[PDB]
Amino acid sequence: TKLQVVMCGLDNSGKTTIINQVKPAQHITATVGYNVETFEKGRVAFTVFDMGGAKKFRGLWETYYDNIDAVIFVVDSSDHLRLCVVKSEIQAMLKHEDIRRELPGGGRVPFLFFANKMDAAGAKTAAELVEILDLTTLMGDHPFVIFASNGLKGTGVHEGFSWLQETASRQS
């Protein structure tokens, strides 16, 4: 079983920290452009495009939507000021052809949302983020879920990936 995933979210949301929690055991810095992570996790081989989240890299994200099995979207739940930017980016990505497309089996591309930095002062819960972003209206027919996460420790992360992998398997 092979999964291709694109990982999106604003700069400093915790994308790279989170993906490193699911990689094999063997210094994180801001991701310039993107990085491809290819690794095994359990019985699955993952290919993850860990996108840079700075404004200047967001134009790249769409290059990696082709044939994708899932989107992972990481929100800094403690960054209230840019929740409007999070919303516009989710809106922008949903309009793209490769995200819109009906999957081979009739399904729609699934989204795993992380409400990350659950430990940070001022963190909003998954429920609060759904209401603020009006996420349910935005996501429409796309299957999605949202879990509070702590990327430093791995809280929420592993369960999110179970959801992604089970949803992908069911769809393929």
Ligand SMILES: Nc1nc2c(ncn2[C@@H]2O[C@H](COP(=O)(O)OP(=O)(O)NP(=O)(O)O)[C@@H](O)[C@H]2O)c(=O)[nH]1
């Ligand atoms: N307190 C706390 N800090 C976190 C959490 N997740 C990530 N961080 C911290 O937030 C900073 C940004 O993390 P990073 O993984 O580089 O974020 P990113 O989304 O890949 N940034 P970019 O889009 O620039 O590549 C790092 O200092 C990291 O340790 C969390 O859940 N809680």
Ligand SMILES: [Mg+2]
């Ligand atoms: Mg990064």
